[PDB]
Subunit: 340 residues, 3 copies
């Protein structure tokens, strides 16, 4: 909600309270999304100030407050800053920003990250260029310096992040993306490669000294219709865990497919149909293993722009004999969102 | 403070900074409220959007930021989300919301939770239906579908919450409350019962497979006068700790009484007089033991609606030979509140 | 940003997103400021309500959200409440507030805490009266009851804070400051002494039962020019660590000097030149050792009041044979700030 706007500076304070609950059988240990209360809230700000006609400064922060913890010792479980960055946009020269933000390969995966509650399985956090990461400097150009309507690109520099955990770490790397949008149609190509840290290399699963990730996407976005598809692959970048051995590391190789089809009725109802499948290849020990594999059917109903509710239903196709221990049960999420 | 209100959506961003200090003798280990700096702040939002004349969507989040921690490792001590839920209210049909919110038995205990700094001792957090809990779906009806002015009820479904701690856990249960308000007078009755988790049962104190809590309340609220009284009981629901043995669990049984008398002078001064006593029965090993027992005398002075200061004084009636180790010293809280 | 102002109550919600990165060689273990992503954000509120013509109530809270943590287990690293207090100001009688706030000796050190990214090295947190501490009650008087323009003083009472750590702890103490400002010129004198806790005394380094800190400051602030200087000393108050022995405690004695010279060009550029040196005397075992010692050259460029960027460069004068293990390498900070 734009709570402030004076002297060329406008501040949008935004947030939401999401009552949420997952239904899966058993202790949801073997299901797709788990089970039980998953309530949470978000609070963030996006500011933008016009330094002059061609120059704009801007910043953004967003935090995640779990609403399913007790007020006891576990009270902070799941809380975190999702985004934190500042930047400048100059005329048709492009924008530049630095901070915790989205990796460039997500310029592609974004296409199918449209499910009511699930989806976007391959867009992991602190996992190089596919989701939100810290220490990324991003340059973006729109309409090719204003010379080509619809042609955009981006290059991104990822600074080394040596964390206590191999999962949340990364070495230096570069990434880029090129996309093109013509009247409802959009196509993207994105790619990044980075150094792996000592600790990532000291891991049991996955083998290499460089991580890679690319994804391409195609979409048709117009006339109440949204159809999108993604295909990408990765080398030693996707994190996996053998639940049996309690071993961990990264998939040597994966091939990822994501399809989404949705329609927005005029009265508020937006049905969703989706398909996801990410399979790992050459896992040291297992061979080829599915990591994610399911059909999604769900629907969101918008009361207006501040209120909505939805049911997301995962029809898990993973099978009980999955070598890594990946869960095979179904999950149903029901939620009620208020937002501003 | 209502910082936003356009297109039927109004956002109230609220909060407070409370400079607070407790005075108790010794290391306040044996006193009622402890001793020393207890400064803290609150930040929350309450939004409400009119989807149409009969339908309203709404959400709320509130957080607690301790102001008495260092900026060192202990910096997060005491921080937590207090409330987080979204919901809908439809015409005279009632409201429904889901998230971290107040258990229904507090519809009763609320009556006497009016002290300047203390009071409301029996309304514990993450303790089934008496205080704030996670994963509660609540239906509330006002004026009996609009057919009976002043007659309200509520039913609430509590979802299992298996936490790492027996204190912060709960099984599934249902609760309800009926209250009636006629011209300054109000009466309430509230009740809930729930399953106890394995871990709650594995505890040294308390014995059963079901937790119960009911409370009734009576109040006279008009003419600058506020007089209220509560009486309730519980089975295996109230958490207790033997300080000697360092044993823990729940009271098999308790009987709780709370009385409050206050007056609001026209110039800002609101004196308070209260009495509280909660006694546990059949504690495995001790027999009957008082858990809370005191007189309260205090006063709040309102400079206006954003500024106030108060002194709350607990005249502890617990005695030094209390079998559980419950403290017997007095405590005096002084505080200065700014809020919006 | 003043997001609210009605009925004599105005709320200023403020914050910033700072994309930040440090450049130091090696693993920045031996450099002055470290190395890598240091992105972060701030969110705070300052409220003020006019109770009547002579009386004002007010409160403030400010929090620090690190933007360089993953969304994993380390997500909360560095987060904390910086300030949290409420208070009243009455006519020319003075103001009083209580909560987590700035120690009075900082009324002096503030003079030179003006560097783009570094500086203010002696103004440690939870370190008695020099930086932000919890449980301080502060009385401030301006213009000597309105009888002497430019003459101000303050007295401050610090309540004992027994934390789990000797570094973040303190006993009771009192502090005061007197300053005088005449047309661009300002002079200050500040002083405080406090009890040290058992745990502080149980430490390997430093010896005494009372901590002291005083600093004097001189400044010339006018005509786009800012020149300031500080000199202060401390007894058993400054925290130090022998990196070799991994020993810790407080410096028996230190002598601190800080000089700053800056100029604000009309077009937005504010160059900075500074010098800092804090040396410990009588360290048990080492003798005299420098703790901080460097030249700073840097510059901030203001796009407007909401957007700026800067480069701060530390020319470390500490030498590689520093007895405590204090780092000797240089550090360069580059940052881009959006704020409101
Ligand atoms: C505003 C500061 C930007 C700092 C960018 C640092 C990038 C470091 O490594 C990039 C490797 O690719
Ligand atoms: C909007 C989602 C509501 C989900 C309610 C789940 C209730 C589960 O158990 C209740 C037991 O009583
Ligand atoms: C508004 C409450 C103020 C409480 C101040 C307590 C000060 C305690 O010790 C001070 C020692 O000097």
């Amino acid at each position: 909600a734009e709570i402030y706007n004076k002297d060329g500076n406008k501040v949008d304070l935004y947030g939401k309270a999401v009552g949420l609950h997952y239904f899966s059988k058993g202790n949801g240990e073997n299901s797709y999304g788990g089970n039980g209360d998953m309530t949470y809230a978000r609070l963030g700000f996006k500011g933008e100030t016009q330094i002059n006609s061609d120059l704009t400064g801007y910043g953004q922060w967003e935090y995640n407050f779990q609403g399913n913890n007790s007020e006891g010792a576990d009270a902070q479980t799941g809380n975190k800053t999702r985004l934190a960055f500042a930047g400048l946009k100059y005329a048709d020269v492009g924008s530049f920003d630095y901070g915790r933000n989205y990796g460039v390969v997500y310029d592609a995966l974004g296409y199918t990250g449209m499910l009511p509650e699930f989806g976007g399985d391959t867009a992991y956090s602190d996992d190089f260029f596919v989701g939100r990461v810290g220490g990324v400097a991003t340059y973006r150009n729109s309409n090719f310096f204003g010379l080509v309507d619809g042609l955009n690109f981006a290059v991104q520099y990822l600074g080394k992040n040596e964390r206590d955990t191999a999962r949340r770490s990364n070495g230096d790397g570069v990434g880029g993306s090129i996309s093109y949008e013509y009247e409802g149609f959009g196509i993207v190509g994105a790619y990044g490669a980075a150094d792996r840290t000592n600790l990532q290399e000291a891991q049991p699963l996955g083998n290499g000294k460089k991580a890679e990730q690319w994804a391409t996407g195609l979409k048709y976005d117009a006339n109440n219709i949204y159809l999108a598809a993604n295909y990408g692959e990765t080398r030693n970048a996707t994190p996996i865990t053998n639940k049996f051995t309690n071993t961990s590391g990264f998939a040597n190789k994966t091939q990822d497919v994501l399809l989404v089809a949705q329609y927005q009725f005029d009265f508020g109802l937006r049905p969703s149909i989706a398909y996801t499948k990410s399979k790992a290849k050459d896992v040291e020990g297992i061979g080829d293993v599915d990591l994610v594999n399911y059909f999604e059917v769900g629907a969101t109903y918008y009361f207006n722009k501040n209120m909505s509710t939805y049911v997301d239903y995962i029809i898990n196709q993973i099978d009980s004999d999955n070598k890594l221990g990946v869960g095979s049960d179904d999950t149903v999420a029901v939620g009620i969102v208020y937002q501003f």
